Design a protein around this ligand. Structure first.
Ligand SMILES: CC(=O)Nc1nc(C)c(S(=O)(=O)Nc2ccc(C)c(C#N)c2)s1
Length: 167
C-alpha cells in the first residue's frame, strides 16, 4: 500500500491521473519524482521548468554543479539527484526531443531508467514541449516499465484521450 490517490489503473504496474506533477509531488512526497530533463539539465520550461520553480531554483543550482563535474547526460540516459522539497529523489530522465530531431526509438531506452526504482511519480516522457505523441509515449511506458509507475498528466483533455484510446 502506498499514498498515491485517485489514479486509474491501466495495467498491473502502470497508473494514471490528471494532475499537476508539482502539486502531486508536494502532497505525496514520493521516494522518486521523474523530471523531463534535457542533457544539460537546463530546466527552463515544461515539466522541468515547473519542478525547478517549485524548488525555488535549488534543483537548477544542484544540476549545474552536477554538469560541471560530470558533463552532459546522454539522450535516453538519467541521473539521480535530490528531490528537494518535492520528493526524496529526483530521477532526471532525458527522452528524445523531436523538435531537435532526436530518434524516437530512444524513448524506450529513456523509460528503461524507471526500472531501477520500485515506485515512481512521473510525467509521460518526450510529451509536451519535447514533441512526441503522448499516446505513443504511454504505449512505450506500459511496454517497457515493469516497476510501479504513477503517471501525472497535466492536461485534462489529453488525459481523457489517453484513457479512452488505451489498448
Ligand atoms: C506547470 C506544468 O506545466 N505542470 C505539468 N505537469 C504535467 C504532468 C504536464 S504534461 O501533462 O503536459 N506532461 C509533460 C511531459 C513532458 C513534457 C516535456 C512536458 C512539457 N513541457 C509536459 S505539465
Amino acid at each position: 500500500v502506498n499514498s498515491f490517490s485517485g489514479y486509474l489503473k491501466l495495467t498491473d504496474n502502470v497508473y494514471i491521473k490528471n494532475a499537476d506533477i508539482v502539486e502531486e509531488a508536494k502532497k505525496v512526497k514520493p521516494t522518486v519524482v521523474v523530471n523531463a530533463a534535457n542533457v544539460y539539465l537546463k530546466h527552463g520550461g515544461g515539466v522541468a521548468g515547473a519542478l525547478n520553480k517549485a524548488t525555488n531554483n535549488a534543483m537548477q543550482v544542484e544540476s549545474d554543479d552536477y554538469i560541471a563535474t560530470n558533463g552532459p547526460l546522454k539522450v535516453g540516459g538519467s541521473c539521480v539527484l535530490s528531490g528537494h522539497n518535492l520528493a526524496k529523489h529526483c530521477l532526471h530522465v532525458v527522452g528524445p526531443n523531436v523538435n531537435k530531431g532526436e530518434d524516437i526509438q530512444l524513448l524506450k531506452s529513456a523509460y528503461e531508467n524507471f526500472n531501477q526504482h520500485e515506485v515512481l511519480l512521473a510525467p509521460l516522457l518526450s510529451a509536451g514541449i519535447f514533441g512526441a505523441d503522448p499516446i505513443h509515449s504511454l504505449r512505450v511506458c506500459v511496454d517497457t516499465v515493469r516497476t510501479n509507475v504513477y503517471l501525472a498528466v497535466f492536461d485534462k483533455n489529453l488525459y481523457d484521450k489517453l484513457v479512452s484510446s488505451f489498448l
